[PDB]
Every structure is written in C-alpha cells, then in structure tokens.
C-alpha cells in the first residue's frame, strides 16, 4: 500500500508531482484530484486527447498550474508556489466503479524561518 511522496518547500519555488503512464490504462479516465488540508478531495485536472494533453476541472482558475504529459508522464507543475497550494495530491484512474490512485503527493510548504522582527521565537522544531 504505497506511500505519498513528501515534498517540502517554500514561497516562489516550482514543483512537479510525477504520475506515470507506465502501467496506466484508459487515459481518459486518468486524473489528478487536489485535496487541500481538512477538505474533501476534488477532481482537479484530467487527461485530454490534445497537444498539451490535459484540461483543468471547470471550476478552475490558475495560470500557475500546468502539466507535462506525453507517453511516459502525467505530471502536474506549479510556478511559484504560494502556500494554499499546500495539500495532498493523488492521481488515479477511475476504472470499473472504483478509482485506484496509482500515486499522489503531499506538498507542505514553508517550514519557516523569515527575517527577524515580528513575532514569538523559540526556534524551532521542539
């Protein structure tokens, strides 16, 4: 039962969550579904017989997101990396009346450590 790839960084980066293709099946039932923290996972963007090769869910505005898709890949990408990006991401192919997430990813941002003037202290990592 596979582990969610854990991947920390911070504001401005760019980050790539790699789902494979690769033992994948009916492309058209292939997805990502974004899960922000404490919410319920929604479908987010799907594969799409075209050049780029995807389409984001209708409910959805953000130039920052895209994917490299081709025969091997089905990766999301984000340019610069805000923080409410913070979430889990699973990529799954609905097949049957079941979806079998063949991967996804946790991306948690800052850590943190941000230029001394305002606030509490004590590091850390207690």
Closest CB to a second copy among 12 and 38? 38
Closest CB to a second copy among 43 and 73? 43
User: Cβ 93 to a second copy, closest distance in Å?
Assistant: 8
User: Cβ 25 to a second copy, closest distance in Å?
Assistant: 11
Binding region for a second copy (CB under 8 A)? 1-4, 6, 28-29, 31, 33, 35-36, 38-43, 46, 88, 90, 92, 94, 96-104, 106, 122, 126
- Omega before residue 124 within 30° of 0, cis: yes
Closest CB to a second copy among 15 and 19? 19
What phi, psi does 119 have (nearest 5°)?
A: 155, -145
Residue 20 DSSP class: B
Please, after which residues is the chain broken with C–N above 2.5 Å? none
User: Cβ 78 to a second copy, closest distance in Å?
Assistant: 19
**Rounded distance between C-alpha atoms, residue 108 and residue 94, angstroms:** 26
End-to-end C-alpha distance for the chain, whole angstroms: 31
User: Cβ 122 to a second copy, closest distance in Å?
Assistant: 8
């Amino acid at each position: 039962i596979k582990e969610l790839h854990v991947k920390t960084v911070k504001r401005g980066e760019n980050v790539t969550m790699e789902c494979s293709m690769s033992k994948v099946t009916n492309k058209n039932n292939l997805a990502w579904y974004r899960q922000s923290f404490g919410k319920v996972p929604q479908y987010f963007v799907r594969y799409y017989s075209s050049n780029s090769g995807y389409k984001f869910a209708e409910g959805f505005k953000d130039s920052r997101f895209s994917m490299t898709v081709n025969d091997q890949k089905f990766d999301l990408n984000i340019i610069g990396a805000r923080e409410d990006d913070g979430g889990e991401y699973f990529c799954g192919e609905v097949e049957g009346i079941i979806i079998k997430f063949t991967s996804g990813t946790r991306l948690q941002f800052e850590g943190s450590n941000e230029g001394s003037k305002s606030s509490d202290g004590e590091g850390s990592s207690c």
